[PDB]
């Protein structure tokens, strides 16, 4: 008989906090007997597992249908905060019913803003703002009008100040147009450098100076330099904290200045400056050309609330939470959940995602404490190459804890004005810069009741814009999926240790260290090494990717960052007490919580490595949004990159929830004139309307539809697709598109004309829109007609009588053949020419981002699988093999990220972890493993392994929505054997290469025809075997 295995709701088993009005149910089935199809199903939903025999929510009754995947709930409207139990049974094609599936459940979340009574809260200004420059003045030497114009020169400044007794803290905030070097009592405490300056006056530094100040007279001295003729000035505040409040010392006319280089000693207390004139105020803070300049603070503050619960039996407790920023919540001394970087990145003006946690076993009778760290994240911290405060200035928390009692009563505890805040140990936390943690600043016991917080500060209501929508998180929360212990420790310079994790990973480390309180360990993170064995970080650009930990002197300390992440294979450790060992550093690999769904293995080590690298490049960049790179100061949701990689991504991980979520981001960013943006979420004024980039709005829904059969993804995308096509028609001339855009980005000196590219993508988008309309039973004629008209305009403009395409590049042919743009009479000629260009390059590809994903497929489509294998197995540059031979463990941004001479490509743009060239994956899975969808969502699977190159042996399992699709084939002593497993309610078309077609032995299925050297079989579900002996 047929049985239901692993039923799911919205792609997952037992989702907690699901807000869908009509959650989509799936029931993979298993059967030892071949050839099974579903004729009917019946779903029941009830308020308890036992209640399913007499269901109180829904009973579909027996529904005549072969649908078994993503069937929408169609009972009475669902209520918020409710657990729904469900079960399904089916009838096979004979009429026999299965067992009822073992009962399962989903639980709704809050389903709408009105169900929140919590308030947004933030730590108060002393905890979320850096010491500021307000009250201070920009000063210079008294020459002319320095705020307008000063010479390109250095000026010198001194001030002796009498500081109060009992100083407990001291900070210096300082900025200069253009650079400065500041000292206290002759010891330099900070500087900026002329060569490194790029409008550094915009970014004041804040420095702790307690170790250099004392009571009584202290001498401050500053040199400052103006880089060119124009505005000059420098500004500072020295804040001294004592138990009786703050004292501030400003830059102002009480400072002495000189314009002639002073004698040495000029920084020392007893130097004679009595002949130096007073410094001149160039502008008060806020005045001059410099505006309201402020230092940036990025602390992850602690927020907490104690409360009393009744002594009654708890039936259930849930915490719903989110942040404008990032948070980690704690309840009664125990961290809540296992998510990292919650709530993730959305356009916070339009939506923020909330999380739901089961905390039933954490709540207590009597005294309870709820607590959270709250950090800047994407909301307020550095984002890409664009700096901080993209959405707001200060992070905010929203939290609602609901406890239900067995007597039917309940309590609700929320974020609000009664919460208290403290700085705690996380001094700085930034996604790009890293995290700085001082264990001495720990407040032991703060996540537990009975804690003394009388000297904590009242929280404030947040002044953040309220997101339009608060929605249950759609994608899998980022979680640690695995740990990578350090594989070796080197010491390439004295006291500078480099630990190799053996894999370029994304996440952060656990540091174990024992040593004296006050010892500071620094951890820098790198993707690659210099030839001397030191870490190379130039390609990271402005992202420091440095975590700093100061010890509390308490046994074997453990430090695990919370509010940052890096992309790296190597960790450089400085300041370690003694010698780190491999146990000192362990990588914690973080990404979206989605399963891997493709196992692939061949007889060829290099292909197995290529597959590993693909899955590592994908997972490294699947953290909240599909990113271009996880390591440098970028990490943006680049449309081009996911456009090319989506079909491969949908083989190797369950990518439906992740890319569904991202397409919501893309549509949130679509411009008012219908242009898809270059990145989504849209930050930093990057462009829009770019061919092969903005087209992700069409190609990514289609890729999800092909992999999963997800009709809802198409329905939700189609109106944005219409608006995109309308935009593209408006921005074209007789349907020909401008030669603008990125083009075939990072091709190997084989540049395709951008108008050929742009017009090809326009047509392809029209083609896909017709295919979507068709799948949805909508009217496709307008789109089909549009496609027809673009293809004609395209062929006339760029395709010659002999089949030559304008630009005569590898990508020019790849794209036209792929998108069905070459007239059919000329496909042979166009493909012949492609092969000719490959042969001419000594059997190397030349394609960039847009050409590469379609190259091996086009080669196979046109009867050149042998050539595809040649490219695939190629080891010399450019190739997939070239980087692998150089020790790659991910896909690089460039074919030559490490060049053949051994040097690096330009650090201006050179990542070792972009998934784009991993798009070769889909060709391997479809052709070596022989697993491809004949109908959307693998309702029919085409099993067409094409042996070739060095592959004589392959095995694969794809975790489809209908269940596992497996293949295993072997060529040996003349003979071929293929076995496969095809799940119930699906069918397969199997192609078996054979000298003599009608001689193939087969356990199941029907010979239908001979084609291209193989017997073609049609087969139903089950375990099949095919053999060809001689």
Pull the structure tokens for residue 929.
Answer: 């493993």
91 a known binding residue? no
* Phi, psi for 455 (deg, rounded to 5): -95, 5
CB of residue 141 vs Ca ion: minimum separation in angstroms?
Answer: 13
> Tokens 């929508």 — which residue?
469
- Residue whose CB is less far from Ca ion, 192 or 362: 192
Burial of 197 from C-beta contacts in 10 A (0-12 / 13-18 / 19+): middle
Query: Is the Cβ–Cβ distance between 209 and 238 less than 8 Å?
Result: yes
Residues that bind Ca ion (CB under 5 A): 177-178, 226, 230
For Ca ion, which is the closer residue by CB, 235 or 1019? 235
Is 491 marked within a binding site?
no
745 is in an annotated binding site: no
Smallest gap from Cβ 805 to Ca ion, in A, equals 52
Q: Is 995 annotated as a binding residue?
A: no
**Does 177 carry a binding-site annotation?**
yes
For residues 256 and 277, the answer to whether their CB atoms sit within 8 Å is yes
Give whichever of 27 and 201 is closer to Ca ion, judged by the CB atom.
201
Q: What long-range pairs does 740-745 form, CB within 8 A, spacing at least 24?
A: 740/690, 741/690, 741/691, 741/692, 741/693, 742/640, 742/690, 742/692, 742/693, 742/849, 743/692, 743/848, 743/850, 744/809, 744/811, 744/847, 744/848, 744/849, 744/850, 744/851, 745/640, 745/848, 745/849, 745/850
Least Å distance, CB 155 to Ca ion, is: 12
Q: In this complex, which beta carbon is closest to Ca ion, that of residue 226 or of residue 905?
A: 226
3-class secondary structure, 788: helix
27 marked ligand binding residue: no
628: annotated binding-site residue? yes
The Cα–Cα gap between 695 and 717 comes to 12
Q: Report in angstroms how near the CB of residue 234 gets to Ca ion at its nearest.
A: 10
- Omega into 343 within 30° of 0, i.e. cis? yes
Instruction: Tell me if 162 is assigned to a ligand binding site.
Output: no
Q: Report the residue number, 226 or 548, with the smaller CB distance to Ca ion.
A: 226
Outline where DSSP puts E strands in 185-251.
187-191, 205-208, 216-225, 233-242, 245-250
The answer to whether the annotation marks 262 as part of a ligand binding site is no
Report the DSSP beta bridge partners of residue 327. 342, 374
Q: Are 427 and 299 in contact (CB under 8 A)?
A: yes
Helices (H), 928-1015: none
Catalytic residue among 402, 411, 527, 634: 634
As measured in angstroms, the least distance from the Cβ of 192 to Ca ion is: 13
Angle subtended at Cα 393 by Cα 627 and Cα 430, rounded to the nearest 5 degrees: 45
- Is the Cβ of residue 60 or residue 192 nearer to Ca ion in the bound state? 192
Six token digits for residue 700: 């990514």
By beta-carbon proximity to Ca ion, the closer residue of 230 and 934 is 230
893 in active site: yes
Nearer to Ca ion, 178 or 448 (CB): 178
Please, how many CA atoms are within 13 Å of residue 562, restricted to the half-sphere of its CB? Answer: 25
What phi and psi values does residue 995 have, to the nearest 5 degrees?
-55, -55
Q: Of the two residues 201 and 745, which places its CB atom closer to Ca ion in the complex?
A: 201
CB of 282 to Ca ion, least distance (A): 11
The answer on whether 914 is annotated among ligand-binding residues is: yes
Alpha helix segments (H runs only) across 841-899? 852-861, 865-873, 881-885
Which 8-state DSSP code applies to residue 36? Answer: -
- Is 201 annotated in some ligand binding site? yes
In this structure, what token pair is assigned to residue 31? 């059967």
Nearer to Ca ion, 57 or 279 (CB): 279
Q: 39, 26, 86, 21: which is closest to 59 by C-alpha?
A: 86
Q: Is 314 in contact with 327 (CB distance < 8 Å)?
A: no
Residue 654: CB atoms within 10 A of its CB come to 21
Residue 232 CB, shortest distance to Ca ion, in Å, is 5
Q: Is the peptide bond before 289 cis (omega within 30 degrees of 0)?
A: no
Q: Residue 139 Cβ, how far from Ca ion at the closest point, in Å?
A: 14
The active-site residue, picked from 10, 435, 572, 893, is 893
* CB of 51 or CB of 230, closer to Ca ion: 230
- Report the C-alpha gap between 64 and 41 in whole angstroms: 7
Q: Closest CB to Ca ion among 177 and 628?
A: 177
Name the minimum Å distance from CB 294 to Ca ion: 19
Distance in angstroms (rounded) separating the CA atoms of residues 489 and 230: 50
Of 405, 398, 447, 442, residue with least CA distance to 424: 442
Listing DSSP states for 683-719 in one string gives -TT--B--TTTTTHHHHHHHHHHHHH--HHHHHHHHH
Q: Is the bond into 178 cis (omega within 30 degrees of 0)?
A: yes
Beta strands in 867-1005 (DSSP E): 932-935, 940-943, 953-960, 963-972, 975-982, 987-993, 1001-1002
CB of 177 to Ca ion, least distance (A): 4
634 annotated as belonging to a binding site for a ligand: yes
CB of 198 to Ca ion, least distance (A): 12
C-alpha angle 775-815-689 in degrees, rounded to nearest 5: 75
Q: What span, in angstroms and rounded, lies between the C-alpha atoms of 335 and 338?
A: 8
Three-state DSSP at 98 gives: coil
**Residue 908 falls in the annotated catalytic set:** no
CB of 207 to Ca ion, least distance (A): 22
Cα-based distances in Å from 1030 to 531, 928, 969: 53, 22, 16
Residues of each annotated binding site: 177-178, 201, 226, 231, 628, 632-634, 641, 693, 914
Binding residues for alpha-L-rhamnose: 177-178, 201, 628, 632-634, 641, 693, 914
* Residues designated catalytic: 634, 893
Known binding residues for Ca(2+) are 177-178, 226, 231
């Amino acid at each position: 008989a047929l049985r239901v295995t692993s039923p799911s709701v919205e792609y997952v088993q037992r989702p907690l906090g699901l807000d869908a009005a009509h959650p989509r149910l799936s029931w993979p089935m298993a059967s030892a007997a071949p050839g099974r199809r579903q004729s009917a199903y019946q779903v029941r939903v009830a308020s308890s597992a036992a209640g399913l025999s007499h269901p109180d929510v829904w009973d579909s009754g027996k529904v005549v249908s072969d649908d078994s995947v993503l069937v929408p709930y169609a009972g009475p409207p669902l209520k918020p905060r409710t657990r729904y139990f469900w079960s399904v049974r089916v009838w096979d094609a004979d009429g026999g019913a299965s067992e009822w599936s073992a009962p399962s459940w989903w639980e709704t979340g809050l389903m709408g803003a009105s169900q929140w009574s919590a308030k947004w809260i933030s730590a108060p200004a002393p905890l979320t703002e850096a010491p500021s420059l307000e009250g201070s003045s920009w000063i210079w030497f008294p020459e002319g009008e320095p705020a307008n114009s000063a010479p390109a020169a250095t000026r010198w400044f001194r001030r002796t100040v009498d500081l109060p007794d009992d100083i407990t803290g001291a900070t210096l905030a300082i900025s200069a147009d253009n650079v400065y070097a500041v000292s206290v009592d002759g010891a330099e405490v900070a500087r900026t450098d002329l060569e490194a300056d790029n409008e550094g006056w915009r970014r004041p530094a804040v420095i702790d100076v307690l170790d250099h100040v004392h009571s009584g007279n202290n001498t401050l001295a500053v040199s400052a330099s103006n880089a060119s003729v124009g505005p000059a000035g420098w500004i500072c505040v020295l804040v001294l904290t004592t138990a009786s409040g703050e004292k501030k010392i400003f830059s102002d006319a009480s400072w002495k200045s000189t314009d002639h280089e002073p004698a040495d000693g000029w920084r020392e207390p007893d130097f004679d400056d009595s002949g130096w004139p007073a410094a001149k105020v160039a502008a008060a803070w806020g005045a001059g050309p410099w505006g309201r300049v402020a230092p940036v603070a990025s602390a992850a503050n602690q927020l907490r609330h104690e409360f009393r619960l009744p002594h009654k039996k708890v039936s259930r407790a849930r915490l719903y939470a989110t942040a404008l920023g990032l948070y980690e919540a704690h309840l009664n001394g125990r961290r809540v959940g296992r998510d990292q970087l919650a709530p993730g990145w959305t356009d916070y003006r339009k939506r923020v995602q909330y999380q739901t946690y089961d905390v039933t076993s954490s709540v207590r009778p009597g005294a309870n404490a709820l607590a959270a760290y709250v950090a800047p994240g994407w909301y307020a911290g550095n984002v890409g190459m664009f700096g901080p405060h993209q959405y707001g200035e200060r992070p905010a928390l929203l939290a609602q804890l609901e406890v239900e009692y067995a007597d039917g009563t309940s309590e609700r505890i929320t974020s609000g004005p009664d919460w208290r805040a403290a700085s705690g140990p996380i001094v700085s936390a930034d996604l790009l810069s890293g995290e700085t943690y001082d264990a001495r600043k720990e407040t032991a016991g703060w996540t537990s009741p009975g804690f003394d917080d009388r000297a904590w500060l009242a929280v404030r209501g947040a002044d953040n814009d309220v997101p339009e929508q608060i929605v249950a998180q759609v994608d899998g929360p980022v979680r640690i999926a695995k740990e990578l212990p350090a594989r070796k420790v080197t010491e390439p310079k004295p006291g500078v240790f480099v630990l190799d994790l053996g894999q370029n990973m994304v996440g952060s480390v656990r540091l174990r260290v024992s040593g004296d309180a006050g010892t500071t360990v620094r951890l820098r993170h790198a993707e690659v090494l210099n030839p001397d064995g030191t870490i190379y970080t130039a390609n990271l650009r402005s992202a420091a990717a440095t975590d700093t930990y100061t010890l509390k002197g308490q046994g074997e300390e453990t430090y695990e960052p919370r509010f940052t992440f890096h992309g790296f294979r190597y960790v450089e450790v400085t300041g370690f007490p003694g010698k780190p060992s491999t146990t000192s550093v362990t990588g914690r690999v973080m990404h979206t919580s989605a399963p891997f769904t493709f196992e692939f293995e061949t007889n060829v080590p290099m292909l197995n490595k290529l597959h590993s690298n693909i899955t590592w490049g994908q997972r490294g960049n699947f953290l909240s949004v599909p990113t271009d790179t996880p390591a440098r100061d970028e990490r943006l949701g680049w449309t081009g990159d996911i456009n090319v990689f989506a079909p491969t991504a949908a083989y190797t991980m369950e990518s439906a929830r992740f890319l569904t979520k991202w397409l919501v981001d893309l549509r949130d960013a679509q411009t008012s004139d219908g242009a898809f943006t270059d990145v989504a979420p849209a930050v930093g004024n990057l462009g829009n309307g770019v061919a092969g980039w903005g087209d992700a709005g069409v190609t990514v829904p289609w890729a999800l539809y092909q992999a999963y059969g997800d009709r809802q993804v198409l329905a939700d995308a189609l109106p944005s697709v219409h608006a995109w096509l309308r935009y593209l028609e408006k921005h074209s001339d007789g349907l020909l598109r401008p030669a603008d855009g990125y083009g075939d980005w990072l091709n190997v000196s084989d540049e395709t004309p951008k108008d050929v590219i742009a017009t090809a993508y326009f047509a392809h988008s029209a083609d896909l829109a017709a295919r979507m309309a068709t799948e949805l039973g909508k009217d496709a004629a307008p789109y089909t007609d549009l496609f027809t008209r673009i293809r004609k305009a395209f062929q006339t403009a760029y395709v010659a009588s002999d089949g030559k395409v304008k630009g005569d590049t590898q990508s020019a042919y790849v794209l036209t053949l792929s998108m069905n743009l070459v007239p059919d009479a000329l496909r042979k000629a166009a493909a012949d020419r492609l092969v000719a260009l490959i042969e001419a390059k000594d059997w190397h590809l030349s394609t960039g981002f847009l050409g590469t994903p379609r190259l091996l497929p086009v080669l196979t489509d046109t009867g050149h699988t042998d050539v595809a294998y040649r490219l695939l197995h190629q080891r010399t540059f450019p190739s997939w093999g070239y980087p692998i031979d150089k020790g790659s463990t991910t896909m690089w941004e460039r074919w030559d990220s490490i060049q053949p001479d051994g040097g690096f490509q330009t650090p201006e743009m050179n990542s070792f972890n972009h998934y784009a060239y991993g798009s070769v994956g889909e060709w391997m899975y479809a052709n070596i493993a022989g697993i491809a969808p004949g109908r959307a969502g693998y309702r029919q699977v085409v099993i067409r392994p094409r042996p070739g190159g060095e592959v004589t042996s392959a095995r694969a399992t794809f975790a489809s929505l209908h269940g596992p699709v497996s293949t295993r084939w072997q060529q040996r002593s003349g003979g071929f054997v293929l076995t496969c497993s095809v799940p119930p309610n699906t069918t397969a078309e199997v192609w078996i290469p054979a000298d003599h077609p009608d001689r193939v032995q087969h356990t199941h299925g029907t010979f239908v025809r001979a084609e291209d050297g193989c017997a073609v079989f049609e087969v139903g579900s089950g375990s099949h075997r095919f053999t060809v002996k001689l």
